[PDB]
């Protein structure tokens, strides 16, 4: 009984915590797209 009780919680927390990696990967994908995009403009305002 203790083993089953531990297994259910372990699986639930594994599934829940493991899903956070995908969100961080999506943020990294956004950063990758941003770098693929060329910057422009805002530098002049900052230097002024």
């Amino acid at each position: 009984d203790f083993h089953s009780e531990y297994i259910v919680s372990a699986s639930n927390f594994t599934s829940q915590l493991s899903s956070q990696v995908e969100q961080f990967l999506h943020r990294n994908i956004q950063e990758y797209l941003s770098i693929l995009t060329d910057p422009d403009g805002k530098g002049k305002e900052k230097i002024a």
Binding site: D38, P39, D40, G43, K44, I47, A48
Partner: protein
């Protein structure tokens, strides 16, 4: 005077930076090199 001159020069050179960004995008697209290959192949045929 020094600050004014520096800002002027930076703003002047900001444009060519964006032109180079466009050229870099074209290069990543690999659309400006095949012509050089064709030219060198033609020269090779002529020399041969």
């Amino acid at each position: 005077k020094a600050a004014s001159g520096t800002t002027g020069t930076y703003q002047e050179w900001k444009d060519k930076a964006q032109n180079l960004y466009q050229e870099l995008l074209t290069q990543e697209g690999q659309a400006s090199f095949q012509g050089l290959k064709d030219n060198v192949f033609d020269g090779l045929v002529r020399v041969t």
